[PDB]
């Protein structure tokens, strides 16, 4: 076979290229949030936590990956730390993505409560806690769930390791039951499914809000036409009672209020006339409603639609991030599943292991590109930083 160093040179070169790009792109993210107070919100605190995890992939995880590819002799607990540290960063990523999804879910479901439920001070606490949990989950093998007690003597002697040392190779020291049941099923796949569920609920909530606006609008307009071709007070009375309900629902910032005050007032004026039997005065009063609608209500309606559309677009953008996370990490997990559940199967070849590893690391490059393409405030801040400071 070809000298191993030839394939190793390609591996190391690609890992270093990923490292540089992971560091540069994610530093730009952090720099942008620092510069631009418009980007300084709780959602972006999680973005910065995720960018920090991606910088740490370039600075630490990639160097550790290069090291462990050599099978160097190491004390088994030192080997575990180098093998498992990337699991801490990946777990931190998962918590940041989960926090973002729930943040956007609260923002769309209880917008009035959001700013008092979800504060910077609480966010910072949540981020600290998530990082501590990430260290505990990813370094669980250091607590004894490891293969350090069952060393590969063949490898130890061939690499000529000293006493207490192992040839530091991932699948020799990290148990596959940990990787499949604990890391993959419990710590990765369950959070990804929860995130899928939350995004689904976001899109369902936006659509139901947009439906309710459009139904209130159409209720207004249709009862306006009922009133016009009406024949008696009872008809006009009913159509106005329906308009009043529709109007109060639509309502649930000074110029906005004034507009609905004019509407409900005009409705209530036409309501008192109807009761007293004056059908034509009620019908005439109701013709006023059309200019209030055109001047005030159609403006609030289109503003509300435009806000919801922006929330849906932002939610799509963040869901893309989760989808790319999944794309980049699932191959390695699926390979581990074959290793573990199919002992009759040939192990995935080395070249495929290293491709899957490289793909996992490429995840730490992509997010700054998604922000730049999808989120105008990031794109514009990146432009300013690049022009001015380069
Ligand atoms: C990637 C680049 C663009 C940016 C990187 C930035 C800088 C700061 C990287 C820092 C790298 C270091 C943290 C790397 C640590 C390397 C360690 C893990 C090597 C360990 C090797 C070792 O133990 O020696 C081998 C022998 O001692 C062994 O065989 C016997 O014990
Ligand atoms: C995020 C997504 C939208 C795009 C990501 C792009 C992905 C596919 C990365 C592209 C890189 C590849 C085209 C090149 C990688 C080739 C490497 C993995 C070959 C590995 C060779 C090998 O087996 O070397 C290691 C061993 O031979 C042994 O010597 C240990 O070092
Ligand atoms: C501020 C940052 C850069 C500090 C980085 C510290 C890192 C590189 C240190 C902390 C713990 C260290 C490990 C401690 C124990 C061992 C076992 C030994 O047999 C081989 C080296 C090895 C595996 C060390 C490699 C380097 C190491 C991983
Ligand atoms: C998430 C998206 C990108 C799908 C990726 C699926 C990948 C991970 C799948 C596609 C086909 C799969 C391979 C098909 C056959 C074998 C041979 C078996 O003896 C070891 C596992 C191995 C090598 C599988 C590992 C995982 C694999 C490479
Ligand atoms: C995509 C997300 C939502 C689900 C992930 C599906 C994973 C867990 C599935 C997809 C394909 C599956 C593999 C398909 C084939 C085999 C070979 C069999 O001898 C053992 C089970 C094994 C190795 C399966 C294990 C579980 C597996 C890897
Ligand atoms: N299975 C696996 N192996 C490795 N590296 C070792 C690749 C390899 C596997 C077999 C071999 O004989 C020589 C090298 N890194 C790995 N990282 C992960 C991982 C991280 C998150 C999910 O899986 N899994 N994983
Ligand atoms: C992109 C900057 C330069 C790229 C680095 C060149 C790669 C050569 C280093 C070779 C060292 C090999 C160490 C042992 C590997 C054996 C693993 C089986
Ligand atoms: C908001 C700043 C980020 C906070 C990061 C601090 C993390 C400190 C290290 C975590 C300690 C947990 C120990 C559990 C694993 C022990 C295994 C030997
Ligand atoms: C298994 C699910 C994975 C599906 C991937 C979802 C991503 C869709 C891509 C469309 C939008 C991408 C915007 C910019 C792409 C830049 C990529 C570096
Ligand atoms: C070998 C390094 C892999 C880096 C691959 C990262 C892909 C990022 C997408 C960039 C697309 C830019 C398109 C501009 C027109
Ligand atoms: C920053 C304050 C300390 C955080 C306290 C974390 C609470 C941990 C509760 C149970 C630990 C479960 C870890 C799984 C091994
Ligand atoms: C054989 C080396 C084992 C070292 C483990 C000692 C540290 C105890 C871990 C406590 C974890 C607390 C984290 C908060 C959940
Ligand atoms: C999302 C579905 C996840 C469940 C996958 C569990 C698969 C277990 C595979 C059992 C294989 C045992 C091998 C027997 C020869
Ligand atoms: C990065 C994940 C996608 C990899 C696509 C390549 C699939 C080819 C798999 C063939 C491997 C068969 C080797 C078994 C001996
Ligand atoms: C409000 C913006 C603050 C930016 C914080 C930057 C944190 C960077 C930590 C990266 C750690 C990698 C080693
Ligand atoms: C704007 C507040 C966000 C602070 C997040 C910073 C996270 C830094 C953790 C560094 C751990 C890297 C090993
Ligand atoms: C006594 C040699 C093996 C011990 C492994 C040390 C790993 C944990 C210490 C690193 C601290 C992180 C900054
Ligand atoms: C600048 C960072 C380069 C990566 C460091 C390489 C570490 C390889 C150690 C080899 C162990 C025998
Ligand atoms: C280290 C400061 C940021 C420099 C910006 C250079 C271009 C960023 C490239 C993104 C992959
Ligand atoms: C575990 C991740 C959940 C983060 C929730 C987001 C903020 C809610 C504060 C009440
Ligand atoms: C593998 C399941 C996670 C996908 C979630 C992405 C939502 C578009
Ligand atoms: C239902 C799970 C049991 C299969 C375990 C197989 C381990 C190789
Ligand atoms: C990028 C593909 C790696 C090489 C595949 C075949 C090597 C035997
Ligand atoms: C200059 C970096 C060399 C990589 C380790 C052999
Ligand atoms: Na990450």
From Swiss-Prot:
An example Gene Ontology biological process: positive regulation of urine volume
GO cellular component: asymmetric synapse; axolemma; dendrite; glutamatergic synapse; intermediate filament; membrane; neuronal cell body; plasma membrane
Residue ranges annotated as Extracellular topological domain: 4-9, 69-79, 146-175, 342-349
Summary of the function given for this chain in its UniProt record: Receptor for adenosine. The activity of this receptor is mediated by G proteins which activate adenylyl cyclase.
Similarity comment: Belongs to the G-protein coupled receptor 1 family.
Organism: Homo sapiens
Glycosylation sites per record: 156
Subunit (UniProt): Interacts (via cytoplasmic C-terminal domain) with USP4; the interaction is direct. May interact with DRD4. Interacts with NECAB2. Interacts (via cytoplasmic C-terminal domain) with GAS2L2; interaction enhances receptor-mediated adenylyl cyclase activity.
Keyword RNA-binding annotated: no
Membrane topology: Multi-pass membrane protein
Protein name: Adenosine receptor A2a
Keywords: Cell membrane, Disulfide bond, G-protein coupled receptor, Glycoprotein, Membrane, Receptor, Transducer, Transmembrane, Transmembrane helix, Ubl conjugation
Keyword presence, Glycosyltransferase: no
Domain of life: Eukaryota
Residue numbers on the Cytoplasmic membrane side: 35-44, 103-122, 201-317
Binding site for adenosine: 171, 336, 360-361
Molecular function as annotated in GO: alpha-actinin binding; calmodulin binding; enzyme binding; G protein-coupled adenosine receptor activity; identical protein binding; lipid binding; protein-containing complex binding; type 5 metabotropic glutamate receptor binding
Subcellular location: Cell membrane
Record text about domains: The cytoplasmic C-terminal domain is necessary for targeting the non-ubiquitinated form of this protein to the cell surface.
Name of the gene encoding the protein in the UniProt record: ADORA2A
Post-translational modification (record): Ubiquitinated. Deubiquitinated by USP4; leading to stabilization and expression at the cell surface.
